[PDB]
């Protein structure tokens, strides 16, 4: 039986990067040839194992963390990387065993008039620990006086929605990013 990469990569809808969707993949054969030879994934490189060499090596648990980010911070999805998404939204550990697939999705996610469904965490007290999923939308306090969850000065809602437009440039287009992580029932 085949591993269900078709329900991840060819899915109808993704999730935003603060609530990044994680699905555990196990007890199946993972055919990676349809991923590498698809010729549609623009950004693809692999850490800890060569991508043409991981086809005949077997892991135990595979997590396919998937989200939608702007095309500039695809470089932020990397081990040992500092930035905005890599600190407040989705941090990869330094010992990251697995790899990242990012392809352009202007033709689906960037609708006419602006797409504001996708938000990213912008204000946070501390940087994220690796593989942390933060769902809380409490009104962030940046100053001394707490302001009890109402909007105002030094009271910022931490999720700023992306402005995704077909008019936007290549760096501002939405890129559906799928991140694979590896650790013995996921063979090739």
């Amino acid at each position, epitope marked *: 039986n085949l591993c269900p990469f078709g329900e991840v990569f060819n899915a109808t809808r993704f999730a935003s990067v603060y609530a990044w969707n994680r699905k555990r993949i196990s007890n199946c054969v993972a055919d990676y040839s349809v991923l590498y030879n698809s010729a549609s994934f623009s950004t693809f490189k692999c850490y800890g194992v060569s991508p043409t060499k991981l086809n005949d090596l077997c892991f135990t648990n595979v997590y396919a963390d998937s989200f939608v980010i702007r095309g500039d911070e695809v470089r932020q999805i990397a081990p040992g990387q500092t930035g905005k998404i890599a600190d407040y939204n989705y941090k990869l550990p330094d010992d990251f065993t697995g790899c990242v697939i990012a392809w352009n999705s202007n033709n689906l996610d960037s609708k006419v008039g602006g797409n504001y469904n996708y938000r990213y965490r912008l204000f946070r007290k501390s940087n994220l620990k690796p593989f942390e999923r933060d769902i809380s939308t409490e009104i962030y306090q940046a*100053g001394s006086k707490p302001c009890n969850g109402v909007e105002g000065f030094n009271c910022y809602f931490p999720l700023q929605s992306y402005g995704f437009q077909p008019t936007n440039g290549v760096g501002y287009q939405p890129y559906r990013v799928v991140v694979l992580s590896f650790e013995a029932t996921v063979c090739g």
Partner: antibody
Amino acid sequence: MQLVQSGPEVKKPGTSVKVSCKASGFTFTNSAMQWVRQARGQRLEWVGWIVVASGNANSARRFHDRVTITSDMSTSTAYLELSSLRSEDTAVYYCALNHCSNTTCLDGFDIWGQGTMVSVS
Amino acid sequence: IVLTQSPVTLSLSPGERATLSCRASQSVRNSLLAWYQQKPGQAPRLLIYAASSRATGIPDRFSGSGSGTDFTLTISRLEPEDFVVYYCQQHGSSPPWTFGQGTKVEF
């Protein structure tokens, strides 16, 4: 720790102004700039404020429909353009910033600009 | 929400004790009534933040006291360069972080 502002612009009652305010010595964190318009011989006023990291501008009620107060984190700047530039707009425009001490931010607009003699001639 | 300040000129001698007060017309939320001074025609600068705290880099002789609506700016030692227009703030509310009329510290 200095906000270098643009120079004066002598304008006309049909035109629009474009006042910039660059932040020197540091980069924009979640710093919440405000903008203060001073007609000479009058009190200070309030134009609007930008959360610079978010870009959520919010202008005052008499300025509700004809000033857009934009910011750019890439250049570490924050702009202002006021529409229709009436004869009761000859003033000095002050970009006031709240200092953020990383771990947190302050509650006071301490570092200011230097002024912009927006002249309506 | 509008902020009214108190006496429009402090016409009294240098080198003594003066009190400055901002009588708000609506109650200031979270006590955010920072105090600025502005010598006429030049850039203002901050003295009191969060309605009581002394600012960083600013020396002594100023004091913000009280919270809510009753409010005091306490200047201790009027040097000749403290004869300046002094301003409130209400950047606490939402919109119209309304200033004051100012006053005139006068000899």
